[PDB]
Amino acid sequence: ANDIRDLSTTEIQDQEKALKEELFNLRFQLATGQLENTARIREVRKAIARMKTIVRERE
RNA sequence: GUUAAGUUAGAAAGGGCGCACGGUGGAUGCCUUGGCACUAGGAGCCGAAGAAGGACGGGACUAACACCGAUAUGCUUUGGG
Ligand SMILES: [Mg+2]
Ligand SMILES: [Mg+2]
Ligand SMILES: [Mg+2]
Ligand SMILES: [Mg+2]
Numbered sequence: 185a186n187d188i189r190d191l192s193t194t195e196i197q198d199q200e201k202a203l204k205e206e207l208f209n210l211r212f213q214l215a216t217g218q219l220e221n222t223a224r225i226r227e228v229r230k231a232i233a234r235m236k237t238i239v240r241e242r243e
Numbered sequence: 244g245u246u247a248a249g250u251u252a253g254a255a256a257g258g259g260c261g262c263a264c265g266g267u268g269g270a271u272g273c274c275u276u277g278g279c280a281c282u283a284g285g286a287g288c289c290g291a292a293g294a295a296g297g298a299c300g301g302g303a304c305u306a307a308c309a310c311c312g313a314u315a316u317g318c319u320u321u322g323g324g
C-alpha cells in the first residue's frame with residue numbers, strides 16, 4: 185500500500201491492467217474446473233480496488 | 244331303578260359399574276428472546292452536490308436474511324485493542 189504510493193501514476197495503471205487480466209484468467213479456470221486455490225480471487229479484487237483508491241485520492 | 248308332581252342352580256353373542264395400564268390432545272405450572280406506560284437528558288428535518296422508498300446485483304459453494312454497489316461479504320487514513 186505504501187509501496188504503491190511510490191509509483192509514478194502511469195505504471196499504476198499498467199498494474200491495474202495486469203491485475204484485471206489475471207482476474208479474468210482466474211475466473212475462466214474456475215468455470216472450467218481447473219482452479220486449485222480459490223483465495224486468489226479476493227486478493228486480486230482488493231489489489232485492484234486499492235490501486236483505484238490511491239489513483240483517485242491523488243487528485 | 245321307572246313314572247309323576249314340585250323347587251332351585253348355571254349361563255354371555257354382546258352390554259353396564261369399579262379398577263389397572265396405554266394412546267391422542269394440548270390445558271396448567273415454571274421460564275423469556277418481545278411488548279406496555281413513564282422519568283431525566285439530547286435532538287427536532289431530508290432533497291437537483293439527486294431525497295424518502297425501492298429494483299437488480301456482489302461470496303469457492305448461495306434459495307433467504309444481514310452487509311455492501313461494477314473499487315460491490317468491501318478500499319484509504321487516524322486512534323483503540
Ligand atoms: Mg357371568
Ligand atoms: Mg354363546
Ligand atoms: Mg366375547
Ligand atoms: Mg363398560
Ligand SMILES: [Mg+2]
Pocket residue numbers: 259260
Ligand atoms: Mg350398573
Ligand SMILES: [Mg+2]
Pocket residue numbers: 260
Ligand atoms: Mg365404566
Ligand SMILES: [Mg+2]
Pocket residue numbers: 261
Ligand atoms: Mg371407571
Ligand SMILES: [Mg+2]
Pocket residue numbers: none
Ligand atoms: Mg402424548
Ligand SMILES: [Mg+2]
Pocket residue numbers: 269270
Ligand atoms: Mg386442552
Ligand SMILES: [Mg+2]
Pocket residue numbers: none
Ligand atoms: Mg422515552
Ligand SMILES: [Mg+2]
Pocket residue numbers: 305306
Ligand atoms: Mg442453492
Ligand SMILES: [Mg+2]
Pocket residue numbers: none
Ligand atoms: Mg466505479
